[PDB]
Design an enzyme around this catalytic site. Structure first.
Site, PDB file in Angstrom:
ATOM      1  N   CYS A   1       0.808  -1.201   0.000  1.00 15.62           N
ATOM      2  CA  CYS A   1       0.000   0.000   0.000  1.00 15.62           C
ATOM      3  C   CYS A   1       0.865   1.286   0.000  1.00 15.62           C
ATOM      4  CB  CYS A   1      -0.954  -0.030   1.210  1.00 15.62           C
ATOM      5  SG  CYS A   1      -0.146   0.203   2.778  1.00 15.62           S
TER       6      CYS A   1
ATOM      7  N   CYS B   1      34.176  36.001  13.986  1.00 14.01           N
ATOM      8  CA  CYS B   1      34.496  36.137  15.424  1.00 14.01           C
ATOM      9  C   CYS B   1      35.468  35.108  15.988  1.00 14.01           C
ATOM     10  CB  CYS B   1      33.232  36.052  16.258  1.00 14.01           C
ATOM     11  SG  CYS B   1      32.158  37.439  16.077  1.00 14.01           S
TER      12      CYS B   1
ATOM     13  N   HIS C   1      -2.263   1.546   7.247  1.00 16.10           N
ATOM     14  CA  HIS C   1      -2.619   1.448   5.839  1.00 16.10           C
ATOM     15  C   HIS C   1      -2.466   2.769   5.082  1.00 16.10           C
ATOM     16  CE1 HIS C   1      -4.209  -1.130   2.687  1.00 16.10           C
ATOM     17  NE2 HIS C   1      -4.997  -0.141   2.301  1.00 16.10           N
TER      18      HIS C   1
ATOM     19  N   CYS D   1      29.026  39.846  15.719  1.00 19.13           N
ATOM     20  CA  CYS D   1      29.572  40.685  14.646  1.00 19.13           C
ATOM     21  C   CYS D   1      28.531  41.051  13.596  1.00 19.13           C
ATOM     22  CB  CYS D   1      30.777  40.018  13.980  1.00 19.13           C
ATOM     23  SG  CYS D   1      30.368  38.581  12.931  1.00 19.13           S
TER      24      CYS D   1
ATOM     25  N   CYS E   1      25.319  35.803  12.994  1.00 18.18           N
ATOM     26  CA  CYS E   1      26.027  35.927  14.262  1.00 18.18           C
ATOM     27  C   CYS E   1      25.510  37.151  15.010  1.00 18.18           C
ATOM     28  CB  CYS E   1      27.523  36.084  14.030  1.00 18.18           C
ATOM     29  SG  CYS E   1      28.397  36.546  15.555  1.00 18.18           S
TER      30      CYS E   1
ATOM     31  N   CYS F   1      31.166  31.223  14.974  1.00 15.99           N
ATOM     32  CA  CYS F   1      31.227  32.254  13.935  1.00 15.99           C
ATOM     33  C   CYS F   1      32.670  32.407  13.495  1.00 15.99           C
ATOM     34  CB  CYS F   1      30.680  33.602  14.426  1.00 15.99           C
ATOM     35  SG  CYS F   1      31.046  35.004  13.312  1.00 15.99           S
TER      36      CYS F   1
HETATM   37 ZN   LIG Z   1      30.480  36.864  14.490  1.00 13.07          ZN
END
Ligand SMILES: [Zn+2]
Lengths: 75, 335
Positions: B14, B215, B292, B165, B162, B212
């Site tokens: 099915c 960063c 089903h 930053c 981020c 990040c």
């Molecule tokens: Zn950053």
């Protein structure tokens, strides 16, 4: 390398991984955070369901890609 | 009329039949099979899975040339899909989305216009990220390029800001379907609610704090999906599984979805009108472990809905297509 996983209820988790990580290893990391067993987990990326025995590299999964976590409705 | 042939249950198949009918009623995919256009795209040389595309196409052809209550036997196609995807060997119950993914993957791989896939992920920071979306898209397209892809493939934009930053790191992920978490907040939960949950700002902090690279450290970041490219066929997958760390249960939550005018402009990254009409639904009834599958399908062009339940095909009204049992939704671009 970071990747993300869109989980079941709308939450996103972050995984530290290497390109050489296996999908099995990726599933353990997901189990480690979400407590869903690997054999229940299905991971979808760019339309491909990710298969054990292969690596993230195989699938061309880059930094900050998202895997989509789904389980199963058997019928 | 036509294409109202049922499919024989071959032993819990099915899940397979439901998908076969949703695809049978996928206009452009059906026509690809009826018009025999796959023959051009097929790869030369002795292959293991040439038979998959030919057997699929022959099933669709049989369905669309049969009399109104004939029963077609997909047994020869099953043999082909189980070779391609061994997990479908035998006669256990399976998930129909897992099936759809493996099948489209198999069909796509065999008619892929790219015969040898090219092997670089360069830095595109000098580019407006709609230009880099396009570059990423063309990079994807030089590895995966078939008529199947023409129909199902969209592009996601993931924007990760981020909070320190302020840098917004963008990645572009292709998708053949979208898997939506289900809103808890019900009067009733809607498809639009599920799409907003998928595309909401995910606040990533603590053990979820991504690093990040500007960063050079782990920061609180905000992540957001938007749709960069809309596919011709939009397949939507309802994540009907609870999160339990012990024992997962199926969420039977009614998700109200529309027949027509699914307007997704809200979700576009910077769109050009992206609106869909429904034409098929794969339904699950049971638990995560068993149950089903059926399909509700709108005959292409005809506006007429039928319930396809293995060998049995039955007219229905559109007021009967929206149910709790809806698990996959097939949408097509509207005019
Ligand atoms: Zn950053």
């Amino acid at each position: 390398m970071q990747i993300f996983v869109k989980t079941l209820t709308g939450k996103t988790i972050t995984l530290e991984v290497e390109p050489s990580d296996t999908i099995e290893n990726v599933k353990a990391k997901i189990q480690d955070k979400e407590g869903i067993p690997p054999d229940q987990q299905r991971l979808i990326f760019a339309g491909k369901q990710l298969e054990d025995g292969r690596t993230l590299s195989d699938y061309n999964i880059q930094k900050e890609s998202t895997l989509h976590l789904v389980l199963r409705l058997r019928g | 009329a036509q294409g109202l042939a049922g499919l024989r249950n071959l032993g819990n198949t099915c899940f397979m039949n439901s998908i076969l009918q949703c695809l049978s009623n996928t206009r452009e995919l059906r026509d690809y099979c009826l018009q025999r256009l796959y023959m051009r795209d097929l790869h030369h040389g002795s292959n293991a899975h040439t038979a998959l595309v030919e057997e699929f196409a022959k099933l669709i052809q049989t369905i669309w040339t049969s009399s109104p209550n004939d029963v077609v036997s997909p047994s020869e196609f099953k043999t082909q899909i189980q070779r391609y995807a061994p997990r479908f060997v035998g006669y256990n119950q399976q998930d129909a989305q897992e099936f759809l993914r493996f099948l489209l993957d198999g069909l796509h791989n065999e008619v892929n216009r790219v015969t040898l896939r090219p092997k670089n992920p360069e830095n595109l920071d000098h580019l407006p990220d709609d230009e880099k979306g396009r570059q990423m898209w063309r990079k994807y397209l030089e590895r995966e390029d078939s008529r199947i892809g023409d129909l199902f493939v969209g592009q996601l934009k993931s924007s990760l800001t981020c909070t320190d930053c302020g840098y917004c790191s963008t990645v572009f992920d292709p998708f053949w379907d979208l898997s939506l978490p289900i809103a808890k907040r019900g009067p009733e939960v809607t498809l639009m609610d599920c799409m907003r949950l998928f595309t909401k700002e995910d606040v990533l902090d603590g053990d979820a704090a991504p690093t990040c690279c500007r960063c050079r450290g782990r920061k609180r970041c905000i992540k957001k999906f938007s749709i960069q490219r809309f596919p011709k066929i939009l397949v939507l997958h309802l994540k009907r599984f609870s999160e339990s760390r012990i024992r997962t249960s199926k969420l039977t939550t009614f998700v109200n979805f529309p027949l027509r005018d699914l307007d997704l402009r809200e979700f576009a990254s910077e769109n050009t009108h992206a609106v869909y009409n429904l034409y098929a639904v794969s339904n699950h009834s049971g638990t995560t472990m068993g149950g089903h599958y059926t399909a509700y399908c709108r005959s292409p062009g005809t506006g007429e809905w039928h319930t396809f339940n293995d060998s049995s095909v039955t007219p229905m009204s559109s007021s009967q297509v929206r149910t709790s049992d809806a698990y996959l939704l097939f949408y097509e671009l509207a005019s």
